[PDB]
């Protein structure tokens, strides 16, 4: 026992390269990387990783585990259980649906302790920016939040209020002075509910109608607005779940001009179109809505061309009764998918569309860690860095069924999907945290 | 036989120049002929030898402030100034007038007040405020040329700015009426958060006012209105744009299909931030004047074709209204609708070698095209309205208060050296202004 654990016989895949090696863990950090078989068989406990690929532990910057207050939607226990099954070793819990929201330093501390008790993998926390809490932002940053999250349009439960233009500007001035970053749900509030009201009036209750009631142009307006505020405030900004390449091109234009902006998408915008929205029905309702097939196809072209900074789940679960309603406008929208993010990426990106695995690491691990100041500690397989990684058999086929899910409620639009590439092991900070079977 | 004949001048239009005599009958053009074709005793004549005949300028943005705040300007001392600037048609803005043109009942009161007072032709801007979609179809059949809304907390008191809810409801209907919405494109919350900060920190220079309502505020607002345009299919007009960065954004939007027009005003083209502090207070406007590099950029855009039309944004107030402790204390606006052609001729044609045809285009013809009065206005052609102005191009002069026909003889253009004076203005066949 010279080392606490050793991964044997794998291919290490990184954000830039692949190579065969043994990786030796000591006190939760990587101690030694060696040529295959170089370390004595009597020098520590070993995971047999022959025929498997070792990715760095995925960093998911967008989850809603909803504990406390709406703990019965997910919880820190089942939430972090799901992530380990999907190869995720670090997650950033969003400040909302959690009730009260993570609005103050006190409300953070209560969430912090429930994560310290129930979470299987490592955690960080989003602070909340709402109309009231401009004095609380300083305190939240001292509480150690990785960033802040405001909403540009009304969403879900109305105890987390969306920010009007005055709130956004005052918060950003403070957040920039804090040396932090603000994430936004960029939809255009008044375009959204004006078009929704029209759609409910006219009995147009299809999946396409929902998509057009919160259209791409609405995403473009809110993105354009927030970029301009960012330019004034010099506040680093992150744009959550973009559905369309049209929006990515506008962010590219801003990046070229000098704006400190990142942009994410989510794997359901990569997997499902309006056709799949129709057939799955209510489980595939999200904000922003799913778009047409042409639009999904163009979004992959954006990803391939480096127009997306990172991928995150936007794991947004609810009580199974909330997913049933009158029509598409009645259903509480959001996708339960954080266990399957790596799976769809590997399946549709690597096997189907021939994206390199190096870019899967970059998008789901490395850039999430860089953008929030956790690099090279996280997002890497290197000497000195945190020993958080995941072993994947890249060629293992499986139909996902509800029995596989570790979500508090096993219901998903990904149920009945055929994947290829299965996580077999997940190691978080030295601790053997998940094994298949 | 002819009611009036303009003799021996050089005609200048939106595309060409030629030496001709122009014959006028019943308020329209009846013949255009080679010099001296018509005998001396076929009607009263005006000697335009040495001069150039431009079609009457059309100024789509004036505030004459009547009724309510008449003593600021008024329809008489407004149209008097316009004729002295070579302007034969104007559109009056609904704000500053008290109470503003919201209903048809407030419209027709302003309509027939201009029947008594107005020397030249007139059209009216309808108003769009918080909740008045009830009166929009009404105002359109009341013959308005378009509608106006503010995106900035400005006007006076109670021309309140239209937020996103109002803007989108308005545009939906304006599209269906088959007309057009003009906007004051400044970002409301960007404006009065940066204004508050600059007041407390004793930063009271004109550069500090300029940065309080910055170019990025214009950009944010223009962008927002362009998307709202795209959603609702409403034709749109961006008022007084101060920078080519804002124009560049509109050119991109034009390429993507958006029905936008954009204007700028002479003060943005003449006065910079150096000239702001030098003149001082009377150079305050919304958006503010920018740095010298920005004024030079704006010219490059104009020359490139990035501006659709020119208007004055004639925004007048009392002398004592241009008095305060600081630059923010003051009610801002520039009186200059007599000088619109004058500065254009001087700065563009003489100084920066812009062709005369292009100054007809931006000050007369495109104002006419954009709002549906072409080729009735904006032209010298047979059958068009006999509205033109005679100019001695090369004629130099200095402008002072005594020359101005405004209600209040105060303007930042006072003391400026112009080259290009208007000698005559004919409006609808009537000889409406003569210099000496
Ligand atoms: Zn979310
Ligand atoms: Zn104005």
Swiss-Prot record, chain A:
Reactions that this protein is recorded to catalyse: (S)-allantoin + H2O = allantoate + H(+)
Pathway: Nitrogen metabolism; (S)-allantoin degradation; allantoate from (S)-allantoin: step 1/1
Modification comment: Carboxylation allows a single lysine to coordinate two zinc ions.
Superkingdom as given in the UniProt entry: Bacteria
Molecular-function GO term, any one: cobalt ion binding
GO aspect biological process, one term: purine nucleobase catabolic process
Any GO CC annotation of this UniProt entry: cytoplasm
Record note on cofactor: Binds 2 Zn(2+) ions per subunit.
EC number: 3.5.2.5
Cofactor(s) essential for the protein: Zn(2+)
SUPFAM superfamilies linked: Composite domain of metallo-dependent hydrolases (SSF51338), Metallo-dependent hydrolases (SSF51556)
Residues given in the record as Zn(2+) 1 binding sites: 62, 64, 149, 314
Annotated Zn(2+) 2 binding sites: 149, 185, 241
Key word Cytoplasm present: no
Keywords tagged on the record: Hydrolase, Metal-binding, Purine metabolism, Zinc
Residues where N6-carboxylysine is found: 149
Enzyme class, UniProt record, top EC level: hydrolase
Purpose: Catalyzes the conversion of allantoin (5-ureidohydantoin) to allantoic acid by hydrolytic cleavage of the five-member hydantoin ring.
Subunit structure: Homotetramer.
Family: Belongs to the metallo-dependent hydrolases superfamily. Allantoinase family.
Protein name: Allantoinase
Organism encoding this protein: Halalkalibacterium halodurans (strain ATCC BAA-125 / DSM 18197 / FERM 7344 / JCM 9153 / C-125)
Lineage, top ranks: Bacteria, Bacillati, Bacillota, Bacilli, Bacillales
Gene name for this UniProt entry: allB
């Amino acid at each position: 026992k010279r080392f606490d654990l050793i991964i044997r016989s794998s291919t290490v895949v990184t954000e830039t390269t692949t190579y065969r090696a043994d990786v030796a863990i000591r006190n939760g950090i990587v101690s030694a990387i060696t040529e295959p078989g170089s370390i004595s068989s009597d020098d520590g406990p070993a995971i047999d990783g022959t025929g498997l690929h070792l990715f760095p532990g995925m960093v998911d910057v967008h989850v809603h585990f909803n504990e406390p207050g709406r703990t019965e939607w997910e919880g820190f226990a089942s939430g972090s259980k799901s992530l380990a099954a999907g190869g995720v070793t670090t997650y950033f819990d969003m400040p909302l649906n959690s009730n009260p929201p993570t609005i103050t330093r006190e409300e953070l501390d209560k969430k912090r302790q429930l994560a310290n008790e129930k979470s299987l993998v490592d955690y960080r926390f989003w602070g909340g920016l709402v109309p009231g809490n401009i004095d609380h932002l300083q305190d939240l940053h001292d509480g150690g939040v990785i960033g802040f999250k405001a909403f540009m349009s009304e969403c879900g439960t109305d105890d987390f209020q969306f920010s009007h233009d005055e709130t956004l500007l005052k918060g950003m001035k403070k957040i920039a002075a804090l040396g932090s970053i603000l994430a936004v749900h960029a939809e255009s509030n008044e375009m959204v509910n004006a078009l929704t009201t029209i759609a409910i009036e006219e009995q147009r209750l299809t999946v396409k109608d929902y998509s057009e009631a919160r259209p791409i142009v609405s995403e473009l307006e809110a993105v354009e607005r927030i970029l301009r505020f960012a330019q004034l405030t010099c506040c680093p900004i992150h744009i959550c779940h973009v559905s369309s390449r049209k929006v990515l091109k506008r962010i590219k234009q801003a990046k070229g001009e000098g704006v400190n902006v990142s942009v994410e998408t989510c794997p359901h915008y990569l997997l499902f179109s309006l056709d799949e929205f129709a057939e799955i029905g209510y489980l595939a309702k999200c904000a922003p809505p799913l778009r047409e097939r042409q639009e999904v196809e163009d979004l992959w072209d954006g990803l391939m061309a480096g127009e997306i900074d990172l991928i995150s789940s936007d794991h947004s679960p609810s009580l199974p009764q909330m997913k049933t309603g009158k029509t598409i406008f009645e259903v509480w929208g959001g996708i339960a998918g954080c266990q399957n993010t790596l799976a769809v990426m590997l399946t549709e990106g690597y096997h189907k569309r021939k994206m390199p695995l190096t870019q899967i690491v970059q998008l789901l691990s490395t850039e999430p860690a860089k953008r929030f100041g956790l690099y090279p500690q996280k997002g890497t397989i290197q000497v000195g860095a945190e020993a958080s990684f995941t072993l994947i058999d890249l060629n293992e086929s499986y139909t996902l069924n509800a029995s596989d899910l570790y979500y508090r409620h096993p219901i998903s639009p990904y149920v009945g999907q055929r994947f290829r590439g299965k996580v077999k092991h997940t190691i978080c900070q030295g601790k053997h945290v998940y094994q298949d079977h």
